[PDB]
A paper describes a structure:
Many streptococci adhere to protein-attached carbohydrates expressed on cell surfaces using Siglec-like binding regions (SLBRs). Siglec-like binding regions (SLBRs) are among the streptococcal adhesive modules that bind sialoglycans. SLBRs contain two adjacent modules: a Siglec domain, which shares some features with mammalian Siglecs, and a Unique domain13 with no close homologs outside of the family. The conserved sialic acid-recognition motif governs general specificity while sequence diversity in surrounding loop regions allows the SLBR to select between related sialoglycans.
To understand selectivity of these SLBRs for human glycans, we chose comparators from each branch for detailed study. From the first branch of the tree (blue in Fig. 2), we selected the SLBRs of the Hsa adhesin from S. gordonii strain Challis (termed SLBRHsa) and the equivalent SLBRs from Streptococcus sanguinis strain SK678 (SLBRSK678) and Streptococcus gordonii strain UB10712 (SLBRUB10712; see footnote). Although these three SLBRs are >80% identical in amino acid sequence, when they were tested with arrays containing 49 sialoglycans, they exhibited distinct binding profiles. In comparison, SLBRUB10712 and SLBRSK678 were more narrowly selective, although both bound to multiple sialoglycan ligands. Specifically, SLBRUB10712 bound strongly to 3’-sialyl-N-acetyllactosamine (3’sLn; Neu5Acα2-3Galβ1-4GlcNAcβ, Fig. 1b) and a small range of related structures, while SLBRSK678 bound to only two of the glycans on this array, 3’sLn and 6-O-sulfo-sialyl Lewis X (6S-sLeX; Neu5Acα2-3Galβ1-4(Fucα1-3)GlcNAc6Sβ, Fig. 1c). To reveal how similar SLBRs could include or exclude different sialoglycans, we determined crystal structures of these five SLBRs at resolutions between 1.0 Å and 1.7 Å. We then evaluated selectivity conferred by the FG loop where crystallographic analysis would suggest that the β-branching of SLBRHsaD356 excludes C3 fucosylation, while the larger, unbranched Gln of SLBRUB10712 and SLBRSK678 can bind fucosylated ligands. Consistent with our prior studies, parent SLBRHsa preferentially bound proteoglycan 4 (460 kD) from human plasma, while SLBRUB10712 bound GPIbα (150 kD).
Author numbering: 244 to 446
The structure:
Amino acid sequence: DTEAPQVKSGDYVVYRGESFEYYAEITDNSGQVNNVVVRNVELDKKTNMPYLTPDWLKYSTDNLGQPGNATVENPLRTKLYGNVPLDTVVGIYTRYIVATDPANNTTRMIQNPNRDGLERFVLTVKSQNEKYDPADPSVTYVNNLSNLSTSERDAVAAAVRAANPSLPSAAKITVSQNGTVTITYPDRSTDTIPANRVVKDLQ
Ligand SMILES: [Ca+2]
Ligand SMILES: [Ca+2]
């Protein structure tokens, strides 16, 4: 056996403050894979060993080291998962999935976008606001569209929550002097709802 295992992955998106779960598929001409490693291409400048960042990106593979566990008909599944911290940066990470067969052939890491979705994958970390699309609330009637009272602002905030049960429980809903709504997600990103869908002049 001189053929390394092959990997089929994809483009993975995750969101701060949210959990994620993706599955990559691994095959080998022998039908058996003994190890799968998800890793940065470069070695940890300290231990001289492979590592994986971000530290919140985890992986696990069931049924390693068993005959017939990685056939083209029934590929081996590696789970990539985690909970994205609220405080991590938003950005892209390009990482590699490398598997080893009984002959100790291991998938090669090739730094080329033409390998994206195979053994190389791009993990996009977006802000939490990008997971949600706030819905307009039932309008609140106000005396003056240019100068909302405290109680009118409170009522708008409640109306926005009532119409958006899917929003993170810890999101903060604030309302400006003209009825503009800001939804501040736990990761501090924001969405806005324009006043003209939220408030109406009483008269
Ligand atoms: Ca092989
Ligand atoms: Ca949004």
